Design a protein around this ligand. Structure first.
Ligand SMILES: O=C(O)c1c[nH]c2ccccc12
Ligand SMILES: O=C(O)c1c[nH]c2ccccc12
Ligand SMILES: [Cl-]
Ligand SMILES: [Cl-]
Lengths: 153, 153
């Protein structure tokens, strides 16, 4: 549950691919719609995430991205430790599935508003990260976790 | 200089358009390459930014985006107060021009590495936000401390 640990998650809707990075300790997410999940796309997505948050470790979402030389290259470039995403703790499988279900539910709730899926996915990221659960939001928690970490060191 | 204030900045390279949002108090940025600066692109970029950080106010980069119905609609959706970016303090213009020069210099430093401009721009966002200035903190550190301190008050 370190401040630096993120998990990649790839989910499908409307025949399109949604790539999600979840900051494990907070539940905070970033997401994008991509044409298909290739090493190049996943690498570019990781480069963007790591320029925005202090990404120390990524649990990749599958073996092909764990194997990908293009993904390993972006992890090397951005200072990220690439790990597998094996759920040694099986409650992981479950948290990620519930998150994909919540995100898809929010996407359906904004369909009268967003003409393209990529808009609906960013509206879903916005509502996911601002939702109060404290009740703190994921957005609040990730900032508190990383700030507290910067202040301990 | 509040924790919620961002400034839009649009700069040009390779005849392509780079759209930047700067968190004014920290210097932290996010950026994208877009085909042209249209209200729809700026709107979509603001929606993404605001799902990621608690954006309270955005100083728009020009009058067309200030005017744009599409931009105003994304600001309404995301809870953002849209303001002009008139530099009432003239040292603003200078600070933005210098960041555009520094960003372009980093893009040049990575051209042996990135085949597409959009990759070079994300590597630049990365190196910009991680740079220690000039006991010195990075922009990435400052934005987290600023917003965390604001949340705790
Ligand atoms: O409300 C807050 O303090 C937030 C800090 N970072 C965020 C990211 C997404 C949404 C809300 C916040
Ligand atoms: O180094 C840190 O603690 C950072 C916190 N937020 C960031 C965003 C980009 C780069 C570094 C950091
Ligand atoms: Cl795929
Ligand atoms: Cl343009």
């Amino acid at each position: 549950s370190s401040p630096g640990i993120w998990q990649l998650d790839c989910t499908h809707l409307e025949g399109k691919v949604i790539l999600v990075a979840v900051h494990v300790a907070s539940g905070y997410i970033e997401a994008e719609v991509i044409p298909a999940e290739t090493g190049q796309e996943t690498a570019y997505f990781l480069l963007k995430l790591a320029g925005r948050w202090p990404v120390k470790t990524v649990h990749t979402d599958n073996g092909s991205n764990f194997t990908s030389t293009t993904v390993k290259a972006a992890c090397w470039w951005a200072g990220i430790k690439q790990e597998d995403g094996i759920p040694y703790n099986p409650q992981s499988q479950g948290v990620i599935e519930s998150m994909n279900k919540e995100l898809k539910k929010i996407i359906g709730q904004v369909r009268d508003q967003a003409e393209h899926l990529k808009t609906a996915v960013q509206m879903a990221v916005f509502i996911h990260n601002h939702k109060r659960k404290g009740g703190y939001s994921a957005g609040e928690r990730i900032v508190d976790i990383i700030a507290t970490d910067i202040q301990t060191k």
